[PDB]
């Protein structure tokens, strides 16, 4: 099925978030570690954050969302992630299910391009 390779990517990614906001090592050697920490440091400075109309915050958004129906840690270290948890438990409280009942709203190849075509000089 699509939805598994989907799954795949988005837990890649999701990985890779919650390892670079836990990453104290912040040279790291890891492709997307480096690539959600420039999003992540970004998003932290930013004024215009999805509400607004920002892209690079609403398409890092799209991956915490994702995470955040799934973490159950009190103080996880992802920055979106205990925001979404609270509304979340406030809303929903029994969270999500698995790949065919999971949050499919993007496209798994798009993810690879959100920390590659992000706002910036050209
Ligand atoms: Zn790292
Ligand atoms: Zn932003
Ligand atoms: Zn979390």
């Known amino acids: 099925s699509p939805q598994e390779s ?6 890649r ?3 890779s978030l919650v390892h670079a906001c836990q990453c104290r090592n ?3 050697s890891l492709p997307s570690c480096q690539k959600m920490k420039r999003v992540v440091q970004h998003t932290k400075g930013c004024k215009r954050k999805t509400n607004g109309g920002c892209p690079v915050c609403k398409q890092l958004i ?12 009190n103080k996880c ?3 979106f992630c205990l925001n979404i ?3 979340l438990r406030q809303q929903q409280g029994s969270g999500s299910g698995s790949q065919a009942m999971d949050d499919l709203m993007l496209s798994p ?5 959100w920390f590659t075509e992000d706002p910036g000089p050209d």
């Open 85 to 87: 948890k609270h509304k």
């Open 109 to 113: 190849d798009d993810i690879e391009q």
């Open 6 to 11: 989907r799954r795949l990517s988005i837990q």
């Open 62 to 73: 799209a991956l915490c969302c994702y995470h955040a129906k799934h973490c159950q840690e």
């Open 77 to 79: 270290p992802v920055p």
């Open 13 to 15: 990614c999701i990985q």
């Open 26 to 28: 912040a040279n790291c």
